[PDB]
Amino acid sequence: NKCDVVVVGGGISGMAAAKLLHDSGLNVVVLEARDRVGGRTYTLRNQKVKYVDLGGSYVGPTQNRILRLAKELGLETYKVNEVERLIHHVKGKSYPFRGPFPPVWNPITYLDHNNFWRTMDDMGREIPSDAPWKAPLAEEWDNMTMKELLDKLCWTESAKQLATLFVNLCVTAETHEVSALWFLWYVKQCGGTTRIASTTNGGQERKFVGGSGQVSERIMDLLGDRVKLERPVIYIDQTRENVLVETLNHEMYEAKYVISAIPPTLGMKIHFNPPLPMMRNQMITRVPLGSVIKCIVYYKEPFWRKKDYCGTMIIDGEEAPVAYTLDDTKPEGNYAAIMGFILAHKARKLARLTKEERLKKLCELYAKVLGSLEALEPVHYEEKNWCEEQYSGGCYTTYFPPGILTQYGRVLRQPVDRIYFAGTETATHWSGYMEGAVEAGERAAREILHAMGKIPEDEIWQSEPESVDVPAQPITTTFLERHLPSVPGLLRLIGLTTI
């Protein structure tokens, strides 16, 4: 019934919000739609897997908030296996390699590829993290899709193909579905193309021992009975002195303030009194989440390491159900596994199959990519299609189709009277990740603390000390990487000696 702050959503964002509120002396309640906490993080435990992350999993350098929160809860990280070779599978053949990107040998193609990544970061540096619609060419970049941008930038099909796979993997959407401005913001606010895409030194470096689900669960442990499970929120009424929050099992909660810690578009599941202001009312119908099936295939041994493959595959081509994989072997060396994502339109297309038909297609793909008949011998399989989640809407996160971010972006975290907005989508650094979740949750909690007169305004946004355990190597370039011409820039140099 009565408390200081109702937190809607028990994902990482709402749990981190609740925790900061609770540690500061406020009476908090978390109302969660599902019969579990964790949201888009979910750790399954059974005998056959021990544990496995079926939703968000990876943490890496620069994600300092989630590392600190997890560390304080008693959690530990281990490194994703990248000891052996990565594989870039393109046009029906596998090419082993090491480093941030597969090596390009054709010099034209090398210029084009180098120019593409460079330009992505170049554009991204024009986009303020906390205000992407403030980019000088915001309008122009928002009024085109990533497909149209790739068409302009890539003078080789090779670069276009690789870039398409990058977009699909980063935002589980098609290049034609997303705003170029948004997508360029999304990469920048994660530290750029190298940081977002890498294992060592990047987004995919680590996982938590025991699963990421422990983050939400351990905060629930601390909060005790303050976390109401199976309370989907249906109605928020701010016409009276205290905010009123009603659940689907007709329970009523009364609070000074509310934090909405749910993906933006799921705000539609809530009836508002009085109605949302116009801009938000429309924004939450315009912000879909991606489509992905996260699949884990278990084997007797991590046989791929014996062939000097670490288990990372970048797999191009329409016939390939999975376009990206990682080694998911437990740190102790057992429960050998390959994690792979079925992305965007393929998540849609292949959801029609049975679980056993999807397993079959994945083993056959891995057999071919790894040149290994053993991949045909799985011992177990787990999978999650995030598109069927009523209380997620998809994964990993919310994407912005063209024209949306500049028109409606401003309102994503604008308070509505006594409702404040958390959820990874409102973050300025690793939005879409567990990291963005902790940032948006703690920031929304702090907005309410300033509203109550408990902290000055300059404590609303707070920077984070760098993890001592997972430190960040800078993202550096080389001279030639910086100054090699693009393909048309070389065509321009050729025109000039010929004139």
Ligand X SMILES: *Cc1cc2c(cc1C)N[C@]1([C@@H](CC=O)c3ccccc3)C(=O)NC(=O)N=C1N2C[C@H](O)[C@H](O)[C@H](O)COP(=O)(O)OP(=O)(O)OC[C@H]1O[C@@H](n2cnc3c(N)ncnc32)[C@H](O)[C@@H]1O
Ligand Y SMILES: *[C]C1=C([C])[C]=C2N=[C@]3([C]([C][C]=O)C4=[C][C]=[C][C]=[C]4)C(=O)[N]C(=O)N=C3N([C][C]([O])[C]([O])[C]([O])[C]OP([O])(=O)OP([O])(=O)O[C][C]3O[C](N4[C]=NC5=C4N=[C]N=C5[N])[C]([O])[C]3[O])C2=[C]1
Ligand Z SMILES: c1ccc2oc(-c3ncc[nH]3)cc2c1
Query: Taking CB under 6 A as the rule, which mask of x and - marks residues 398-437 in contact with ligand Y?
Result: -------------------------xx-------xxxxxx
CA distance linking residue 316 with residue 334, whole number of Å = 29
The reply to whether 149 sits near ligand X by the rule CB under 6 A is no
How would you classify the pairing of strands 5-8 and 257-260?
A: parallel
Pick the closer one to ligand Z by CB: 35 or 105.
Answer: 105
Q: What is residue 330's three-state secondary structure?
A: coil
Of 72-91, binders to ligand Z (CB under 6 A) are 86
- Are residues 175 and 147 in contact, defined by beta-carbon separation less than 8 angstroms? yes
CA distance linking residue 245 with residue 251, whole number of Å = 8
Query: Taking CB under 6 A as the rule, which mask of x and - marks residues 194-233 in contact with ligand Z?
Result: ---xxx----------------------------------
Least distance to ligand Z, CB of residue 304, Å: 15
Taking residue 30's Cβ as centre, other Cβ atoms within 10 Å add up to 30
For residue 262, count CB atoms less than 10 angstroms from its CB and return exposed for 0-12, middle for 13-18, buried for 19 or more.
buried
With CB under 6 A as the contact rule, the residue among 263, 264, 302, 402 that binds ligand Y is: 263
Pick the closer one to ligand Z by CB: 26 or 162.
Answer: 162
Of 228-257, binders to ligand Y (CB under 6 A) are 232-233
- Are residues 327 and 422 in contact, defined by beta-carbon separation less than 8 angstroms? no
With CB under 8 A as the contact rule, the residue among 143, 372, 414, 486 that binds its own copies is: 143
Cis peptide bond prior to 274, omega within 30° of 0: yes
Q: Which residue has the tokens 């705000």?
A: 267
The edge-to-edge listing of strands for the beta sheet with 380-385 is 93-97, 85-90, 309-315, 324-327, 337-343, 292-298, 380-385
CA distance linking residue 496 with residue 163, whole number of Å = 30
Cβ neighbours of residue 76 under 8 Å, at least 6 residues apart?
208, 209
With CB under 6 A as the contact rule, the residue among 314, 395, 444, 470 that binds ligand Y is: 395
Pick the closer one to ligand Y by CB: 390 or 462.
Answer: 390
With CB under 6 A as the contact rule, the residue among 21, 31, 245, 255 that binds ligand Y is: 31
Of 270-299, binders to its own copies (CB under 8 A) are 271-272, 275-279, 281-282, 285-289, 291
The edge-to-edge listing of strands for the beta sheet with 252-255 is 252-255, 243-247, 233-237, 271-273
The reply to whether 340 sits near ligand X by the rule CB under 6 A is no
Could you tell me the CA-to-CA distances from 140 to 143, 150, 399, 409 in Å, in that order? 5, 15, 18, 15
Residue 62 token pair: 């620069």
The reply to whether 397 sits near ligand X by the rule CB under 6 A is yes
Least distance to its own copies, CB of residue 288, Å: 4
Query: Which part of the chain contacts ligand Z (CB under 6 A), choosing from 64-72, 165-173, 289-297, 461-469?
Result: 165-173
> Half-sphere exposure of 97 toward its Cβ, with a 13 Å CA cutoff?
15
- Which residues lie near ligand Y (CB under 6 A)? 8-14, 31-34, 39-41, 55-58, 170, 203-204, 232-233, 261-263, 266, 269, 292, 294, 386, 391-392, 395-397, 423-424, 432-437
Where along the sequence are the contacts to its own copies (CB under 8 A)? 142-145, 147-148, 174, 176-177, 232, 234-235, 248, 250, 265-266, 268-269, 271-272, 275-279, 281-282, 285-289, 291, 345, 348, 351, 385, 387-390, 393-394, 401-404, 407-408
